[PDB]
Design a protein around this nucleic acid. Sequence first.
RNA 1: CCCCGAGAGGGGGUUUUUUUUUUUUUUUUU
Lengths: 242, 948, 213, 49
Amino acid sequence: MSRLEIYSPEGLRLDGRRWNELRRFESSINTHPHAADGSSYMEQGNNKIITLVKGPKEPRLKSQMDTSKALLNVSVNITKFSKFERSKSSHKNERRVLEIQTSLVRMFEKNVMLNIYPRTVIDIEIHVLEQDGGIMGSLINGITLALIDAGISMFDYISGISVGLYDTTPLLDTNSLEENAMSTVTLGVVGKSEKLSLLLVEDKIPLDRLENVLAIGIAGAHRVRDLMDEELRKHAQKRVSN
Amino acid sequence: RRKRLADGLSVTQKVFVRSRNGGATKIVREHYLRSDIPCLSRSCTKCPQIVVPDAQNELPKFILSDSPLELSAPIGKHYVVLDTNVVLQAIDLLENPNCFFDVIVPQIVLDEVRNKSYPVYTRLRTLCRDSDDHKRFIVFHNEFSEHTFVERLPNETINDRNNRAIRKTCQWYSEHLKPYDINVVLVTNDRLNREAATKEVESNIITKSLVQYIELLPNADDIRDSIPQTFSDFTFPEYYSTARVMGGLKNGVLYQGNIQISEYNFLEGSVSLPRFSKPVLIVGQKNLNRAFNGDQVIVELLPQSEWKAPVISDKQRRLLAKDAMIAQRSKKIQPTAKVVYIQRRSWRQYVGQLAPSSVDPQSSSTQNVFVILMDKCLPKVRIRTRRAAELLDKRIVISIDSWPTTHKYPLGHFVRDLGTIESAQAETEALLLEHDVEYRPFSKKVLECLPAEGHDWKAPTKLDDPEAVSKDPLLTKRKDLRDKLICSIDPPGCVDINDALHAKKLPNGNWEVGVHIADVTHFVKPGTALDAEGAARGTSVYLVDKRIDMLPMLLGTDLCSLKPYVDRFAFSVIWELDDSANIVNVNFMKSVIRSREAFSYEQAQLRIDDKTQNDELTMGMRALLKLSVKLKQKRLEAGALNLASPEVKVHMDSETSDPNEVEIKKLLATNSLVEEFMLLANISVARKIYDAFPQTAMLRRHAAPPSTNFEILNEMLNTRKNMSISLESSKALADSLDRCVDPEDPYFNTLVRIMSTRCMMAAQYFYSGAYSYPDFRHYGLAVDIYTHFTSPIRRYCDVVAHRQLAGAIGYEPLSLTHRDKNKMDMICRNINRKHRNAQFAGRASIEYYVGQVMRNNESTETGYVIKVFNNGIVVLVPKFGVEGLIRLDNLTEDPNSAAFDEVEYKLTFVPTNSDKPRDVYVFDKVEVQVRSVMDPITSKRKAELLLK
Amino acid sequence: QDRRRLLGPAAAKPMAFSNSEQELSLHTGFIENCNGSALVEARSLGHQTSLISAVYGPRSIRGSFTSQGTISIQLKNGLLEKYNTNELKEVSSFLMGIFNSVVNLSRYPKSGIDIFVYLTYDKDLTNSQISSLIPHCITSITLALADAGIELVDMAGAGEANGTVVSFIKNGEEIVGFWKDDGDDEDLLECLDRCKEQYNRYRDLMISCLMNQ
Amino acid sequence: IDERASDLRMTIRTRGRSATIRETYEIICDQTKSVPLMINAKNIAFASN
RNA sequence: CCCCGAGAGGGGGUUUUUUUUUUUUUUUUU
Ligand SMILES: [Br-]
Ligand SMILES: [Br-]
Ligand SMILES: [Br-]
Ligand SMILES: [Br-]
Ligand SMILES: [Br-]
Ligand SMILES: [Mg+2]
Ligand SMILES: [Zn+2]
């Protein structure tokens, strides 16, 4: 029971967007040159994410070294000031966060060509400065951009998106208010394909609605890919022209 | 700042502070500025070119008429844009069919109304949603439109920005509708907008106040009475601030609860507080502080010296609270308090009549009058009117605006004219809406959910037909029982048939009994407006006059109705039981049937008894009755109750107009036939749905009656008739009630039954997760579990049970709304309230018509004394089913010589037409002269009785 | 609660109740478990302190290689008075800087000298208090290191005056550490003199303890 | 405990129904007065290996 | 396989958290 107009009869949402509109998507490449080999600053809505890619480089411990592939590590730092209400405890060892880090690794292990960087380590540090729904999808886009900036070989883009289901109405790119009022589905689409790297459903969804929700997400993720690709070629032209 | 995006879309930052529980949180949301916001006008030729479809691929409809209400220049044709205040104050006038036809409601207004008053916001949205050819309301999202969106200027209050926002919308609409010669009128009571438009600094905007606008309409005199508005010896104290009471509740200083004000005493109220055992009394008129009965009020405990015998700091107030709890346990002195805040008013549209005392016939101008509300527990209201002579002897609908600390009586305004008092039209309409019964016809959105076929809908001949299966893939699960001999036994004028029965004798000696219930679920689907209205009404009310249906006529009295000679969908329950009516097995299945014949209760009984007709159908009907006797036998032996209250049936003269005859409905054996199989159906379904959904099963329980309820009845029985009711068990209560019979008068047993029915606990609906299994017990039926299932057309509870049974058998997955413990709690609390309102309205309908039969007639009827007091007696007339009060003054002569013995419930007095001391005990059959007279104060047709 | 300790029932709530210049005591080498140990007890006015220091080293460090030794200092809360972990870490860092100027690290390649200071009994009898404990810590660590046989450039001691703590070496000519919380303004010269007096007294008693005992 | 501490029950509301959390009395220890622990001295054993 | 040396020698092929509009009779068909 929501007293707010999540989806008005006029087809308008609480923030003004319609059912199939992405939030403000602004990417940024090479933001921390003196701190990492690759870096990206993501702004997807009110979401603010710093992503740092450090590597490929020498492992700090020879015990943890693979002679056939690079070691891929991801650490997500959800800051205590990411939400409106400051969290008292840290999230560093939170099981929810360990799953997120693990999830991201399992995604890019099959995209990043780790086999061509044996005996090395790729460390991915992430700092979430502000959070407002669809943080998982934004995490995916931040890593993909930062990895490309580092000149690390990969097969294709991986675009992330979230889709809510308000009763029967699908809502592309959900914010915090919408996620609190409905079940959402997080997608990780590879390139322009229909293949999903990540399918994440944490709340109840009718089996009949799931296929349609996936269809909306994939279409939306393709637009995220285009925006990422667009901003990347723009930065490429501004650098290659000097 | 403001960012421009690729789609021509913009985005800014909406930041506000949310104060909650003394906390301060900075809330920030992004605010998108569009460019494709439709004006929603029929005249517009630009907007439809820029409009986009929604989620369900449906473009929004332009509803604002191309030729609105034309008014004297320079207004001409015009649209109306509303302010926040004029909506909150005159929502009744905004629903009036005779004004406000094309209205534009800004988003900022809709938002402010939602925050200030949610119920008004709902009513405003309903006006927008239910737009027809008479009334048209829209919502222009001005905050989302880049053309109309304004931002707070440096050093500007939020109230002035919002007023400027509304004014900007009017300015935009005006310029946008210039080529169509349609002006815009801003209806606002705020002096800021009127002054800003009067000066005409920037753009030309037609601004009118509410009263000033009404005076420009053709029917100004007909709608001026709907405009919301020394008169004291003392003055009520001001209410505490919201911030104060919020801190008071949090610091255990103030307490909130619902206040009760009795019609016997308007100077004393009592609040039910959780921290206190016994209700806190509120003595005085200043202490009640303009509170109504049923209002949620916040009270402050008065000093101990101000308490009734039948501080500075917060610390002392909490100590006073503890001393109050102690005093309530001692039962010597009882704590008092005073209301200091009204949380939630119980105000609504009330029905009443003008008091002839406060209206001057000589006056021609506007005058103040009083209206006497039909609620005897409620005060009277002041009304501003000019048609005081035209509303003199009529039932009127009024709504309370406010109750100033100065004014002695609350202020309100006129709404509708129901009609002349004691008329079938006005009295029935007043009767319904006083018990909160929606009688208005179903909206267009509701009727659109009905099948596209209409009345020519038909069940498919073949249940495997490609076309039929393509449309209905669940049709393969549908069983075929059209070979069975189904018949329906319902009252004469019954068109809405819910149940249908049949019976066959299986080759193994056992019987096959099938109860078939209307398949309403197949037509009403969760989420639709049809289902929404169905849940809202909860149940259809039954009056002698009319019949307010829960579902549309097309659905309830045709399609879903198990009419004879036609193929109908049904939810069937088939048993296999022996000759001793013992269930061997039971199966639930959705099926398609065809009723052989729709019998009447009298028609069915005659066909069973005549012994001339021995066809297969009649042979099954007798088999049903035979099994009905067995089932009723076992049930009573199990401890089933046999209460009674056979109310009278108003036999309206079908040769004239007004009702003339009052008869009594007789229970035939066919009534026991249907009853027994309906109970059997409900029981089996209850067991099945609870087994499938143990936590959200729509059930119905009946609490065991407390000893205190029967201690008074047993007191009168053991004293006068020297008898008693066991109360040890339901069977014990039934057996002792059964032997409670007087040989000199057969009706004595009926009188005790109809009187012991009044002291039974109310049965209520609930969900299986709210209580434990032993609490599922139904005392009056002596069953471990029970529900309602057999009447989905007239009960929404059965609709829920149907959907749950369908999921139980695996026909179709149960909707999420019937598996949410929270949603189920709301459904149960609603249908429980609608159920009570249904029976009360039903009994009130009987009361009016019977009261009209005895209007101008006097007859010596048979009466029975049910209540004996020192102020008089109360006698019941079984012939008319009306209880009457005989006051001591009209009971006998010399009231000082009469004596009342409470121990024996005896009232001795000397009759007016005699001089012999007569002792009138209780339960006595006495001769009583009936007479009806409308009270000049309450305007209620009461039955004055004079004993003989 | 915790699966490694017995902390009792969770519904239980702790018991809350209603309403010369310095006297020293020094002892060394009473802990056979380690290489060096010291007991420092001080009693003055309305505050007494009994702390124990323990030096473990030089022991193995299995990581890379270092030409000099690596010192670590950890302060532990005692039984009575507790302190913030942050505050104990801060003093530890301040103490590390001091003894990295005194300990002849060159004599202990690829070795570790782990110094523990137990704030065993700190009674507050007044019917940032950590500043008054600092000079006693330095005294304990100096005694323990000397008792362990770890080479020191000079006997490091300290003093405290109005929230200001300063540790001296070389007869008070130079400073190996400066600490200041609260206090007043332009009171540096007065604090240096008062602390040097405490430094001199502590150093004399330390030498007297390392020799005679 | 305090004779009559102002802090009484705390009302918590559900979805329609109301409930009251029992008043929690703050137990306080005496600054001076104390009683000796009642140990079964017959049972006190001493350790050796 | 790769590096090194006028003479088939040597070096390497990596190690638990945005969930709360409160009120007076059983049962069946209407
Ligand atoms: Br709506
Ligand atoms: Br309370
Ligand atoms: Br209808
Ligand atoms: Br037929
Ligand atoms: Br434990
Ligand atoms: Mg029926
Ligand atoms: Zn337009």
